[PDB]
Amino acid sequence: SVTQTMKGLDIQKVAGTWYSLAMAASDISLLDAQSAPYRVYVEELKPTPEGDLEILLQKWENGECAQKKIIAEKTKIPAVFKINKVLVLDTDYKKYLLFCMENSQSLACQCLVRTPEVDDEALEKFDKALKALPMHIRLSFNPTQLEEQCHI
Amino acid sequence: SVTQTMKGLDIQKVAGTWYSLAMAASDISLLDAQSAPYRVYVEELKPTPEGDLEILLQKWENGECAQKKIIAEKTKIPAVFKINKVLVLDTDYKKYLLFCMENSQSLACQCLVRTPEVDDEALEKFDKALKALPMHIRLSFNPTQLEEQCHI
Numbered sequence: 001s002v003t004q005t006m007k008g009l010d011i012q013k014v015a016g017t018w019y020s021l022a023m024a025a026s027d028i029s030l031l032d033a034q035s036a037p038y039r040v041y042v043e044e045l046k047p048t049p050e051g052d053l054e055i056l057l058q059k060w061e062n063g064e065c066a067q068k069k070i071i072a073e074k075t076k077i078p079a080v081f082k083i084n085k086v087l088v089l090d091t092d093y094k095k096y097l098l099f100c101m102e103n104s105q106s107l108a109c110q111c112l113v114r115t116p117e118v119d120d121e122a123l124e125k126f127d128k129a130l131k132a133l134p135m136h137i138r139l140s141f142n143p144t145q146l147e148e149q150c151h152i
Numbered sequence: 153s154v155t156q157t158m159k160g161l162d163i164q165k166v167a168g169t170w171y172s173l174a175m176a177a178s179d180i181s182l183l184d185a186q187s188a189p190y191r192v193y194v195e196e197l198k199p200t201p202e203g204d205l206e207i208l209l210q211k212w213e214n215g216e217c218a219q220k221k222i223i224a225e226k227t228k229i230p231a232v233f234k235i236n237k238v239l240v241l242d243t244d245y246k247k248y249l250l251f252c253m254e255n256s257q258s259l260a261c262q263c264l265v266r267t268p269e270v271d272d273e274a275l276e277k278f279d280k281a282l283k284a285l286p287m288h289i290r291l292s293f294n295p296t297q298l299e300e301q302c303h304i
């Protein structure tokens with residue numbers, strides 16, 4: 001599984017606007033196509049007062065880019081949420097957030113960033129985090145693509 | 153461009169059987185689909201006595217895995233061949249070979265290995281080599297997939 005988790009995570013401080021700067025997955029089929037199952041682009045995190053996590057994302061399907069609203073239910077553990085588990089690996093709230101989704105084992109991780117900008121330090125932390133994980137596909141987006149619906 | 157090249161390359165010593173262990177590209181569309189243009193799997197390098205390079209590869213197209221024979225013409229420079237330029241970055245002849253293809257700028261690099269085995273040292277050299285290059289997609293294959301036509 002994923003052996004890395006943010007201690008003392010303040011879910012309220014991750015609210016707002018994020019960009020899916022990089023994505024990686026255990027299996028090529030999870031991200032290879034615009035419509036692959038883990039090819040989802042984060043737009044906004046809406047934490048509830050009850051401590052759950054409403055996610056706004058983009059997902060390409062039936063040939064166009066759909067906006068989708070998902071709920072990740074809090075758990076026993078603070079850096080873990082359920083839909084499929086969502087684990088928050090690391091974040092500084094103001095610049096970057098790393099997270100992984102795992103089922104059952106299918107696994108996908110992203111480097112979220114606050115601005116439409118290539119952040120090398122945050123890409124570095126993502127790479128370090130991935131070293132320990134059995135990834136077979138990695139994608140990254142350029143600033144033009146970050147400002148486009150479904151990163152086209 | 154690519155700023156890395158094997159000094160003193162003995163083209164005759166790269167003959168024989170190779171496996172496409174990892175691939176990376178400047179643009180997602182160059183490797184994302186089974187039929188993407190730089191998604192080609194090396195099977196065998198046949199150097200000519202004239203010093204050219206006959207390549208046997210697999211390429212998925214019109215829904216099946218085709219065997220294709222290509223000629224890379226030698227140039228002024230020994231670690232450079234022409235079809236699109238092919239640059240040999242590094243090789244130890246017995247275990248791994250790193251190479252890049254560039255046009256015009258579209259760029260794709262592979263980590264070839266001699267055996268159907270995950271070679272971490274060779275994946276490390278590939279990563280180091282890629283750091284200096286503007287890659288946005290990376291793929292890697294497992295030993296089951298290395299023994300299959302078109303790595304399925």
Ligand SMILES: CCCCCCCCCCCC(=O)O
Nearest residue numbers: 037038040055086088099101
């Ligand atoms: C705390 C960060 C929340 C991470 C956002 C995850 C959004 C996608 C989760 C499930 C993706 C899917 O529906 O395939």
Ligand SMILES: CCCCCCCCCCCC(=O)O
Nearest residue numbers: 189190192207238240251253
């Ligand atoms: C010296 C190593 C030779 C490298 C093998 C390159 C094979 C593919 C080159 C062109 C690929 C294509 O046809 O798209």
Ligand SMILES: [Cl-]
Nearest residue numbers: 074075076077
């Ligand atoms: Cl729980």
Ligand SMILES: [Cl-]
Nearest residue numbers: 226227228229
């Ligand atoms: Cl020449």
